[PDB]
Symmetry: D2
Subunit: 498 residues, 4 copies
């Protein structure tokens, strides 16, 4: 017998040893006599409409596909739990943190970003690391990435950015001109691009990478005080990356390497886990931070903002039905329980709207009714009703209007969001020149070593070489601004390729 | 205090007297601090995207509506059961009738035909009387009307007919020219038209009308022997209609009369019931039938095909949430368990396709998952998977292909459909010219007395008068063919109106 | 008979000599016979080979789309807008750029609660949405036949609507729901008073006024901004329907409004409205006795006189109601340079809702629908794909911005007007803002003895079916408006009970 | 400069060198002032709903995706024309064949089968070769493959088959057990499986493979005489295949190799073309045929049924916008003009419903309104109306019902389908046991040479080795029935891999 993943059916069959097989039926529960032949008028006669068994089955088959996630299409999933290991109640009143030892069920989905559903796992691309906490105060979705930062600092460019990362609207081909025209034109990307083209650009499976909330968030405590925070979840399996050669080879031998790896890890009991930490920055600290504490292209230096342990994330359960538990899963950053709130980070602010929006499309108006999306650890009650595919009792006959003198659900004052005062004009503040290099310099010079700097360049050049000369120069100019050697080294490599 | 219906909220409140109101939450189950004021910058400042509570509720509100039924849009719903009173196992083997005293849960929806959701109940129009039986062999939908016949005998004319019965494509107004041009051009309608324009055209509520399967179906017993049949469910509350005047008055005073009546009736304990009967024609009789036994414009004279008592239909339960239980309910005539099958009635044949098709549209691909539509008294097991809003376990990790050697669901021979021999050309056989007057003549002369015949002509005249003269002439020519008196009486009336 | 009734006859005549076109499937395949399906033998079963059938049936099975969540019942027409006065000092919007300038428009009138098959002549406010196809993109002025509204915060809308519609269980209209809500939210008094007055049931769409209702902002070439109110008065005059008549018409002709408008236009009696605006400077807004952005308040014409701008003329009926009316979509957010929103919470909420609901009711690419596309402007951006992409998807143009390949460029002059606000970012309760003053002035001055009487009996007529306690809560609110208002009402309730 | 494909944007640019860039607008046509920054209160404040520019663009981005084709998701498209070169009007009256020299615009889409959108092109899997002829009598969709046969012969087994070719429902991976269990259990597949694992299993791009309608169709002439036929379109570029190694390499170096190849060829004037042929069989021959002429697992021996030249298929136009022209395109086998009809081939009979059914799903009710699918060379006139995204004048105020006395479209008597006499029971006849080996043996023995047989076996064993031994045994037994050397060779190889 092979790996647990390939023995799926066998095991399933074996689990129903002394069991009689179920009667094959139509979607309406009507028993089927022969689902192996269609109804024709005579052996060599035409098909009949009366064959509803056929139609019923075919019609469903003709409808099993839904739109894939506009981004992070390709992915994997697992379930497990979150466990509180440390007291951070002085920062957040969130029930999910209330007591050390408290466990909250979680659902996770790892994923690449650019490729569609049939693309490979072992390719350079950041990785999605979404977490769904089913808490008593509703679901908390920490839709993070394997990176603490991102390519841009303003939501309105995301569509374009994604467009540049995807296929040429006409040829339907990946287009390095698109990729680098955008990147060279928008140097804020410089930070994430460096991360991207480094060794961590292609993690060895999902268990060997870190997770981050990336954006700065706000934590409010029982007394109502509030501080800003960052979420970090380090792999307990340790960071491990794939060499470009192996990544390339595997992308050929097993496009689903990531899915397979995870399933077998859990299937054999090697349950992966991550240690959950947070970074805290008081309003006063934020005021004097050397950068914009909400700029997604920046990080909070550990030296200045030490990691504060919070708990453990553990995945011990594989999905039973991928489509139902993984494909259909939906995470909304806007899903925050009392104690956790949003920060003025423009990128975040954007995602606040986008996620429920896209879900209403990809999945449907009542996507939250879907089992894996349902906040089963909370009592959903409100004045919302109906909608396509209303799968529950639709809250029965409870009064559907607020306020009302008939005892329908009431709002609880203690759940009010924290309020801060802001000043200045209401307009479009440009942020294209918000220091696009400083931290990148620190990364290149202080974080990486010679060996790694070499590879990073080789990686950037290997792809960049296919872009037009003028783009190459533009890109290189920005790289030179990060550090002279960074740009020069790349250029040299380009010279050879060209 | 008032009618049970009007006291709806009051009761709900009373039933929950001793308990505390639920906590108002968003869709993701997050508690809400204030759902009465949105978030703004300062008292008179703009709105924030951060106010997801707002967006969450609005977004759902924005999506409450689903496509109303393409026909029979306005209706009422209720629940109860069907009880077998007589043994007809010698004709059918369907579990629904397996033994006297057996009870099967039922769902029923009454409706008009042409009008849209906000139309009145008390208007001349046939009435929908659909029943859903939750059988062990899956669901059985007996989608019937309050008439044993219909206006046309070929499905391909249905869309047209319906169009002629709805609004003018440009003015969006009802159009007597459209209605009568079709009817006058298509005389098969004479029969039903006559029935529609009689006192039965406006039933006093849904409790005082009969129900019919209309089409000729086929029953199969345990020996494999089959026969054709008709279904009839006579009102035990007795036939009762509304006068033209009262209906007109009611349409204005209470457009929802039927809904109110039914709800209250049940709410007060006066559960309505119908005696279920069947007619039976052997294959031999089918050969000697003076007309086409599968012609939806023909009836089986009670004289030669006596009604056979089978059981009772009982509605003892009001819906709890209209949208979820009535609006979303779907009936498919194709849903027939072993022991009950379709006949070659072209109309029925067409219906075998239409319903599940249209349901996949207004409700959705997995419309059968919806609670009210689920065949909860049977275990649904097959090789159908995925699809939008797949609210279930999607049958987990079970093998998804048939055949398979891993224990998945199996076809059951006993459930094989009965088969009839057929020979001939595969083409479009015209039926426009089948008998369109004989049975109509019987109805006019015999089923109706002088008072009724008078009213019928007035009703027709009252409406036909607004059609152009040529149309009037054509239409009068048809009636005259049924009977000189019929044609003349109408013309006499038309002359006066003109 | 009337033009409407002759719709088909005229179509037939319009061709006259012409033979009929060939009947084809959706794929354009000619149909041999569309009156009989394919069976095996005269009395045999139906074949799947009959695709002509399936083709037609399948489409029929999908004819419907969700009716508008509200204002489902309506009527439409088209025409134009003509500038007659120069207000370029207040707005640089191209629609007003010059006296005599004509811009095509699209209008849809509607009721509110009732669904698609409900009657026209019922008490309810009336939607008066206008779509301007300008060179600077479409401008949707989504108005009502009233200057005010029942609430001042958006988060209460879904709730209000619910109360106005059917009970969730019985599916019936519930006066308890209606009044419990109103009685609990007295800010509704103003509009409620308007609703139960003679204007409650206009005599058709041609005899009522149109209002932008909300406070908006105009911006001129110099970058100077002012607040405004859009008003469009019927040139056919205000004409209402007595309850008795409305009732009868609701039975006799549930579509009286649709027929009336159609026949009017079909017979050359093109209806028109005179477009006006009220203006308030930023400083005036500082001293206004109430929140100038409160949707339950009006700007006294006495302190803010109407300034004529142009005319609104409807002279073209729809050719296909579905395609041209049912599918039409108005987005309050559709405002060209020169016209912007004000901080009116309600409006702010609508900015979001309409396009949102539209993607649901019509689809992602609902702007590609003929009646909905800005045909007077050239759409060029980085938006691509999505369901039913009916244009050319902007061909092979670079789909990312910025780009070095000549794709569309933003134009600075289009930047919105920037104001500087302050205060904490939170939910500021507004339930206690003045809820009576203007209402009292409506009852005392806008109305006369007869109107007040009717108003009271109309309210009583409906309010009497609600539970006594709600009746009490309601009357109390009315009494705060005016003692006689409350007293007259209660007296009537007393007889009813 | 590089390959035309990669110079996409630059050429687009240059073609507009002589004109100012268009004004960036909202979807509503409202000019945008700054689409690079969102509106916020202050430099570090939250996002406002007022920013409709952001929402507008974002909302659409959120809806870019639609469901990918349930099968043949990965594909490439091109446009060109069909030109008649010989006369077959004695066989068919179809307008597309009426005269030599007649050209007809065509749309074509190539594809794989099992893989999803982000999958590699150069893989072992059949190839879709669909053609759409925009004819005066409407569109004609000849939805063929690069093979004259298929794995199964009955429609109802299709979903299963596909399911077995795709991912495991739980693990979401490819499953050789699923793949081979089905095939081994259904020996009908032998023939097509043999083709699949032959050298033509991986053609060198789309230009070096053939195309066939596979199904037996029916042709009717101007005299009403009918015959049966097959459609073959041989590549004028010649058969050229890729070795496993290469396909493996390319699938990594360039997953879209197919797309690129096709694009560049057309872009550089090397327009690919195919010679269109037909085989004919008379009704009398249909009776003397050794097998069921309508059996999709059977071919018509060239010797007995010679190829008859008809015309040429030429492709000279690349898509301008892939999504709008390729992703959205739709082919319906049921789209057949007078002169061309369906045969009693079950598989075909099934496809007759599936295609337009699945299109109403992945595209929409009005999917025929999409330009590329619109039958622009014909005048669409009927009684159909409304429906989501009705992008037309909806046939204006024309009478929507048939028949009518108002001059609306009329049916054309000369468009009636040719009728055939049939006789038999309306039932499910089994076909699993028709001949599953003879024609397969011929291919192995007479068509293939030694080294070709060798490779064939190596490819089969190379995949099958990962299935459960018992599956291997059944499979081998099947291959042995075809020929001893076939099974023995494969077993020999299996023994080594194990
Ligand atoms: C009864 C068996 C079959 C069924 C039910 C079936 C069903 C389907 C479905 C549902 C699609 C996707 C349609 C879409 O999303 O546009 C499809 C596509 C396709 N099938 Fe079939 N198929 C069957 C047999 C075949 C056969 C035998 C052929 C070739 C002769 C064929 C060739 C293709 C091709 C070429 C496509 C892709 C069309 C495109 O490029 O858009 N199919 N099939």
């Amino acid at each position: 017998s092979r790996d647990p993943a390939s023995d799926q059916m066998q095991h399933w069959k074996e689990q129903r040893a002394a069991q009689k097989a179920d009667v094959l039926t139509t979607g309406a529960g009507n028993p089927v006599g022969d689902k192996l032949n269609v109804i024709t008028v005579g052996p060599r006669g035409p098909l009949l409409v009366q064959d509803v068994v056929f139609t019923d089955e075919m019609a469903h088959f003709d409808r099993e596909r839904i739109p894939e996630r506009v981004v992070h299409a390709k992915g994997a999933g697992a379930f497990g739990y979150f466990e509180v290991t440390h007291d951070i109640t002085k920062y957040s009143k969130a029930k999910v943190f209330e007591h050390i030892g408290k466990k909250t069920p979680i659902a996770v989905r790892f994923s690449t970003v650019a490729g569609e559903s049939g693309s490979a796992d072992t390719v350079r691309d950041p990785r999605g690391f979404a977490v769904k906490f089913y808490t008593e105060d509703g679901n908390w979705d920490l839709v993070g990435n394997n990176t603490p930062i991102f390519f841009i600092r303003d939501p309105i460019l995301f569509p374009s950015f994604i467009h540049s990362q995807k296929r040429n609207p006409q040829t339907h081909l990946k287009d390095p001109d698109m990729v680098w025209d955008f990147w060279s034109l928008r140097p804020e990307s410089l930070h994430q691009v460096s991360f991207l083209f480094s060794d961590r650009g292609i993690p060895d499976g999902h268990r060997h990478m870190n997770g981050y909330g990336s954006h700065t968030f706000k934590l409010v405590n029982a007394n109502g005080e509030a501080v800003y925070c960052k979420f970090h979840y380090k792999t307990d399996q340790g960071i491990k990356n794939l060499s470009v050669e192996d990544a390339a080879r595997l992308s050929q031998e097993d496009p689903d390497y990531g899915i397979r790896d995870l399933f077998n890890a859990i299937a054999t009991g090697k349950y992966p886990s991550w240690t959950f930490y947070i970074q805290v920055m008081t309003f006063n600290q934020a005021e004097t931070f050397p950068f914009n504490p909400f700029d997604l292209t920046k990080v909070w230096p550990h030296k200045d903002y030490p990691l504060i342990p919070v708990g453990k994330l553990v995945l011990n359960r594989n999905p039973v039905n991928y489509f139902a538990e993984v494909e259909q899963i939906a995470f909304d950053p806007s899903n925050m329980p009392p104690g956790i709130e949003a920060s003025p980070d423009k990128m975040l602010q954007g995602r606040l709207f986008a996620y429920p929006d896209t879900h209403r499309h990809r999945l449907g108006p009542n996507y939250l009714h879907i089992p894996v999306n349902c906040p089963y650890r909370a009592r959903v009650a409100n004045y919302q009703r109906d909608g396509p595919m209303c799968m529950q009792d639709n809250q029965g006959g409870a009064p559907n209007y607020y306020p009302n003198s008939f005892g329908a659900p009431e709002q609880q004052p203690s759940a009010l969001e924290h309020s801060i005062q802001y000043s200045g004009e209401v307009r479009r503040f440009n942020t294209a020149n918000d220091d696009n290099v400083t931290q990148v310099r620190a990364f290149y010079v202080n974080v990486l070593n010679e060996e790694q700097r070499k590879r990073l360049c080789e990686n950037i050049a290997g792809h960049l070489k296919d872009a037009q000369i003028f783009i190459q120069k533009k890109a290189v100019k920005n790289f030179t601004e990060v550090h002279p050697d960074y740009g020069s080294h790349i250029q040299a490599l380009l010279d050879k390729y060209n």
